[PDB]
Design a protein around this ligand. Sequence first.
Ligand SMILES: [Zn+2]
Ligand SMILES: [Zn+2]
Ligand SMILES: [Zn+2]
Length: 572
Amino acid sequence: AVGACVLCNSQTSLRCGACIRRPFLCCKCCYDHVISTSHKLVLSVNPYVCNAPGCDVTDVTQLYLGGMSYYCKSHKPPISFPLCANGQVFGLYKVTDFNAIATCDWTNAGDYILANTCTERLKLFAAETLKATEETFKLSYGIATVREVLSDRELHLSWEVGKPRPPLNRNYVFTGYQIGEYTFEKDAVVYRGTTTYKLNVGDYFVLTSHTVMPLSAPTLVPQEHYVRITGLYPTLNISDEFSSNVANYQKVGMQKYSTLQGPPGTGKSHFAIGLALYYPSARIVYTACSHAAVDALCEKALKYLPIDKCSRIIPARARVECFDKFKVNSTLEQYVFCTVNALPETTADIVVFDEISMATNYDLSVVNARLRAKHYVYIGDPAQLPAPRTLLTKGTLEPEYFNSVCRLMKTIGPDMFLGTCRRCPAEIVDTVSALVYDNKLKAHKDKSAQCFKMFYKGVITHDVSSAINRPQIGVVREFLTRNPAWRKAVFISPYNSQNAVASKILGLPTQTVDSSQGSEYDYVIFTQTTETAHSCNVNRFNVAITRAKVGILCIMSDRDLYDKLQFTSLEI
Ligand SMILES: [Zn+2]
Ligand SMILES: [Zn+2]
Ligand SMILES: [Zn+2]
C-alpha cells in the first residue's frame, strides 16, 4: 500500500485502520491523528498489531518495533523503539479538522460546515466518508416482504421486527426482489414500479446501497483567468434573443470556471442554451444531478440547437422516464445531455452544470473526474433547495455550506447574476427579492392582483412524521367553490402526506416544494401545513411561491413568513 497523505501529500505506507475510508497518513499526521482520536489501528503493508501469539494489542501508542516486528509493552524485546514518539509513527518515507471529519456521525450541521470550510483534499475525504456513512445507514432499515396485492397501483406490506421502518415517500427508492426499483406513497399504500410487474406476494423490497467510489478530482478545479477567449470561437452574427448575455458569454471564455446565480425565472436555461449559439463549433456537455434538470435543458435545446448534434445519455439501468426526442446514448454528439451519475469519460470545450444548489461536493468531484473541459459553467441559485442530507437531524445547513460553488456564490458573490425575474407577478418577486436576494431581484411582470395570503393554523395531524392539515385543505376547498378559475392550479405543500389528502379532497395535481423546483405553473395553491423549521425554511419558501406565473394562494401557519408575503390578505 504505497500512496500519498491526505493532509500533506507526503508519500507514506501508513493508512488509518479505524477510518471507514482508510486514508493514507504521513508519519507526522498519522501520529497527530491517533494521539487525538479513538482511532488507534494503523495499517502499512502489515497492521501495526502485536506479533506475540494470541496477543490482542492493536493500539499504536501501546506498541514498539522489536528488530523487524511489532510488539506491545508486555512482549517487546530489550532493543525496541516505540512506534509513537516525537510527534511521529514509524513508517516509510519519514489537522484538527481531519480528526473531526474522520470521527463525526454526520448527524449535526457543524459536520457539513467543516466538510466545506476545510482544504480541498479534506473536502474529498469528507464527501467520500459521508457518502460511505449514508450507504451503511441504509442497511440498518428493515426488509418489506409483500403480504398481499389489491390492484395495479395498491398493495399491503409486512415489515421486519427490531429494525426500524424507513419513511414512505418517493425520496427513498427500494429495489424489488430482481423485479426492478419501486417507490411508495401512504394500512392502504400506493405501490409504483420502475418496471411494470404483476405484484408477487412473498417478494421483498430492499434500499439498494451503491458502492461509494473514491474521489480523486477536486470539487472545483484551480481557477484560471485569461486575457482572451480560450479554445472557443464566438459568432458576430448572434441573434438579438441572446444579446443580453453576450458580455457574460465572453466572461465564460476568459476564465477556467464561472458561477451564475439565477433566481427563479431569470433565464438560466436560456443562458445555458445561448452559450452554444455564441460558441457554435464548441462541444458542450450539459449536466445536472436530476433527470428532470437534464430534461429541462433538453427542452430548451430542442427549440434553438440542431436536433442531430443532440444526444440524451440514459444509464443502461433506467429508473425514471426522461427525454425521448434526441438520439439516445450517442456519446460523441456535439451536445450531450446527461445526469452526473451517468457521465461517460470524455472531454469538452464547455461543461455546463445546472441546478448547482442540488449538487454535493461528491457530485462536483465526479464531474471533474469524468469530464476534462476548457471551460466549466456552474448554474444555479443558493437561495433554492439543496440536496437532502439524509443523516442530518440536528442543526440547519446554510446555503454557503451546500457545496464549494454555493460557498463561493454566498461569500465572494457569483461571477454572473440574472437580475430580472420574467416569470412571476410582481407581488411574488418583491417578496423573494427582500427575503433571499437582498433586494437585487427585479420584477419584469406587473402585479397580477391574483396573489393571496390567508393566516390559518388549522389542525396538525401526522402520518408518522409527515404532516397533514385538513382544515387548510378545507379552506382551499371553500376558496375553490368561489374562485373556479383556480380549478387549473397545482397544489403545493412541504409534505407528501398533506399532498395525498389534498389530491383526494381537491382533485388538483399535487407537488411537494422540493419536487416543484425548476417547474412553473399559472396558478399555485400552497398550504404551509406546519410551523416547523422544514416548512419555515426560507429557501423552500422562495421555491414554493416562485412556481407561479399568474396567481398564488398561500394558506400560512408562520406569522413571520405570512407578514413577509406582499400579497392581498383574504378572510374566512
Ligand atoms: Zn501529513
Ligand atoms: Zn482514523
Ligand atoms: Zn503483545
